[PDB]
Amino acid sequence: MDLKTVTGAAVELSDTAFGREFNEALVHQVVTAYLAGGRQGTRAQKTRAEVSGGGIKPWRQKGTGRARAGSIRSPIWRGGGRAFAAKPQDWSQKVNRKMYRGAMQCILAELIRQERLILVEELTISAPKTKELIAKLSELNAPRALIITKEVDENLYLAARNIPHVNVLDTSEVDPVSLIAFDKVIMSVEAAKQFEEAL
Amino acid sequence: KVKMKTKSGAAKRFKRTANGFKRKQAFKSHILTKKSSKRIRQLRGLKMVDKSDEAAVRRMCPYI
Amino acid sequence: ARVKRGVQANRRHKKILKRAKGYYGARSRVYRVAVQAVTKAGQYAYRDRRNKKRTFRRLWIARINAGARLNGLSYSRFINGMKKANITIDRRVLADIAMHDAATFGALVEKAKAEL
Amino acid sequence: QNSASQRSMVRTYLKRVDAAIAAKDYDAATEAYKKAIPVLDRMADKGIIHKNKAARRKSRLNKTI
Amino acid sequence: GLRLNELSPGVGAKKTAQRRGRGIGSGLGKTGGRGVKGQKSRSGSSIRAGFEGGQTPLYRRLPKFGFTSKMAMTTAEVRLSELNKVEGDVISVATLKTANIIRHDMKRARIILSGDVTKAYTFQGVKVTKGAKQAIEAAGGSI
RNA sequence: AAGAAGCGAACGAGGGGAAGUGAAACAUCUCAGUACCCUUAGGAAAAGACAUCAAAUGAGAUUCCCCAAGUAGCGGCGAGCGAACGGGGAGAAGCCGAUUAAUGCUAAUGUAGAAGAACAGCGUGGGAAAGCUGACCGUAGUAGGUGAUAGUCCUGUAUUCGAAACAUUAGCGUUAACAUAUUAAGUAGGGCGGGACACGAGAAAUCCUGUCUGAAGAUGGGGGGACCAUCCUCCAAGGCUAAAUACUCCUGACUGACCGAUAGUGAACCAGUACCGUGAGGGAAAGGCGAAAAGAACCCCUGUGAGGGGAGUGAAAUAGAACCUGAAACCGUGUGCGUACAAGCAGUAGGAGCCUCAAUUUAUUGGGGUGACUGCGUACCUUUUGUAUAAUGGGUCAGCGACUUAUAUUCUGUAGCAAGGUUAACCGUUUAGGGGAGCCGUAGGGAAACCGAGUCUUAAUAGGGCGUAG
DSSP states (O other), X not given: OEEEBSSOOEEEOOHHHHSOOOOHXXXXXHHHHHHHHTOOOOOOOOOTTTSSOOOSOSSOSSSSXXXXXXXXXXXXXXXXXOTTOOOOOOOOOOOOHHHHHHHHHHHHHHHHHTTOEXXXXXXXXXXXXXXXXXXXXHHHTOSSOXXXXXXXXXHHHHHHHHSSSOEEEESSXXXXXXXXXXXXXXXXXXXXXXXXXXX | OOOOOOOHHHHHHOEEOSXXXXXXXXXXXXXXXXXXXXXXXXXXXXXXXXXXXXXXXXXXXXXX | OOOOOHHHHHHHHHHHHHHTTTOOGGGXXXXXXXXXXXXXXXXXXXXXXXXXXXXXXXXXXXXXXXXXXXXXXXXXXXXXXXXXXXXXXXXXXHHHHHXXXXXXXXXXXXXXXXXX | OHHHHHHHHHHHHHHHHHHHHHHTOHXXXXXXXXXXXXXXXXXXXXXSSOHHHXXXXXXXXXXXX | OOOTTSOOOOTTTOOOOOOSSSOSXXXXXXXXXXXXXXXXXXXXXXXXXXXXXXXXXXXXXXXOOXXXXXXXXXXXXXXXXXXXXXXXXXXXXXXXXXXXXXXXXXXXXXXXXXXXXXXXXXXXXXXXXXXXXXXXXXXXXXX
8 A cells, every 4th residue: 555665755556456465366367378378379280181192092902911091191101191180279368357457456466565566756767878777776776677667768668678687668568477577576656556547 | 150050940849948848749730539638638738848858958959 | 299209118118128127038028028927927926925825824834733743743633722721822933933943842732732 | 578668669659749749849740750760660570560550650640740 | 476487276277188098097098988889989979969869859759839929039128127237317228228238129128027226217118017117116217 | 567375373253063971771952052174364353332221210332350140041841051130340432534554753662782889817628608706888688600508709689871773662744555324125024944042932022044025114113022002212224443351383571388300391311303104193211420521641461352450530439431329129249047857828926056246253144146946827908798718919129100179058166256247350559458249147928919026828816837146
């Protein structure tokens, strides 16, 4: 509810969006759905129909003393088609709107609970230059962090992108896999308010 | 899109109800003359599908 | 996500061929024969684990009979005399005493014959 | 994540251009739009945003200007 | 909020699928539960719906009865508990459509005594049962 | 004088058009207007403006997507086939020149390229990129290589960028080829026989026509699912029209919980090759030395052969060219024990002796190898009432080999919301957010009208049937 900025300013964040109890099963479902929808699912094998040749019966049904065959591209044979050859698949899952919103709520609440969320009044990099961002991170004692705030400036983006584990995202376009993955989170009070309105 | 095909005749034969299936009784079409009046009166009216038969009726007509 | 069976198949087959060490012919060299010999060996071990107790009771009874007849008594009377004397010594210990200590078995036979 | 940040950076500039349209000042809109153009062209190559969509946005913005 | 390394679905959320013909120990070996060699153990075997082995099926033993009424497809019954979705006080067919209580192509609507009326409504072009009317005018609505 | 011919992926349009199969048979039907044959275009094609629906307060061309809905219907009413009205979206456009082909300007793109930051010391190592220490660049930090794993060694990446010449796209200008109806008669409709409409002649509307016929022509005609009347809607017998839609022989960039030499294209290799066939046609196998050939000078045995032993090289030569590793079947050599008086699924439970390692203050135990002798013991799988069965299958080893995917539906578990739940297509700087069309539940009775915690049957208000947390 009542949090501190790095400077010391008191911030009022609602409990339903930043204090909801952690639901591990729901967070798991949403995170796995995001990971599954990250899949391309582009592959295929060739069935006996589409494997080259194989139209003729290799030998006559009886009299040769051999196990019967109908084609040289049956899955039993070397070089034959795949029984149940895979095709392109759609791995995306439909996440319920409320389930996703609640998973985000729980993720934020647990980030606060384990102190991996840091509120700042503002974060504006004066010029495109990595070292300035590194200097700011030095005083904030957050070598690795995920930065989310009202808007993303080109200079802050250019500074952030090169850094190994520093990434910048707008408040609207925020993912649970990112929030969970990156060790520390830097987030503005205005962005927090907009998260309250969104959730 | 691909959907299950309900049997058209089954759809006509069976009508849905809350807890059962209702069907018309047999043996009323024709030669009725020899049949006794009590049999005709008893045959008249709706009847309830048997517990065993309901399982197959459900597979035949799921949407109903 | 293809799976190759080579490594796991190799280790599975090596386990059986290791348990089949010392067997004759194909039984210790080729898997199709070794696996049957290992299963049949396990069956024999399972059955002889039952049978060994019977065999050793047989041997103990034979030795006790020999000792009792050396001391002038038969097994069916010596055991009856034990049971009437309330002597609880098992047949394994009785056979050990008969085989390695003649005088103590003579004393036991004396007690049995006094109880008969 | 990186691609998401690349996408994120453009939206702020487009919102600024929209505010410039609301102001109805020629130079303020022009500077912001010219600032945006190359970044959109660059993102088009990556395939994150459709080339047809980028061309439609450029035509709409030019018409607005 | 935890790590990606330590999220779990919870007990009972996930079940492992059965794989037929993967040895003796699995309990599905050699057959996959299909039994022994009959018609139902073959690859393309099914349970033909409405088939009794040659005996004339039940749905052909019994006669067809009734006809389908086209009016019944355009008439929607409305429950008293569903009116909390209505915007305003007037209850007409168009208001029901915009409240999504009835489908957009329904021509007629009927209100029945199923739940309770929380506020006073004005039922204009709809049929109201005896109990629904009494409950409506008990809640204050006038028809 | 100008065109055409022939070749070549898929998609489009049109002229013909099967059978296996399913119905547990089979002829109606299905398969299916699918396979195949034939003709012919364009980047799309077709269609397209109402002689269309609707019956609602009416809407306003065509095309495609999600619902409506597996509903209404058709159906040896069997198997199966299967809409439409309308709602929500994509895209929007109406015209009578929305045509083709060049040439000439303006703008842009493409077809070669250029620059492009920052690391040293120490120890190990054949070799440093890895280890320790301490630095630097970052609009360039998970790229490929370099003797082991490099942001700072190389090629690269971020970023900024060049065109003499030619192509392509758009805008403009101009030319020369073609076209430019003026409201529609052998036409609408009808008889016979067929075909298409979800619709199989059915009460069968609507469309097409092989045959024979044949109007009105605005005071008229078409449709509104037999048909009549009223009512509503629109003007066939002239032509054209972009977008949203379908595809990939190809070109550029990028991607992959796709494969890694029995896999992945048949083809990673001189592959549609060798080989097989008269021909149509079928159709393989086969990758890897080492970081760098530094690919073994020279000597020896040998026939100037093969092959090898030295020497040398290499970090390594049982890395020596059939060259990374190097399993199994299979076949050798050596050491230990057993075996030539003893009958059989060859093992197992005991067990003497012998050999070999360790202990141990020294033939006693522990580990390992063999196994004289005693007891028991007729393989595995399959199929069966029942198998050692003389019933099937397997010569052995290595690799490959068989319950899957999509959608629909029912039950169960779990999670979110909860008398409510949820969106689909689509928009979206695209996993967010919007999109409430639509679906399930909440009410049932009856064939239906209709009624409704009731309802059906009945003259009956009696009796009875069905009913009274998703």
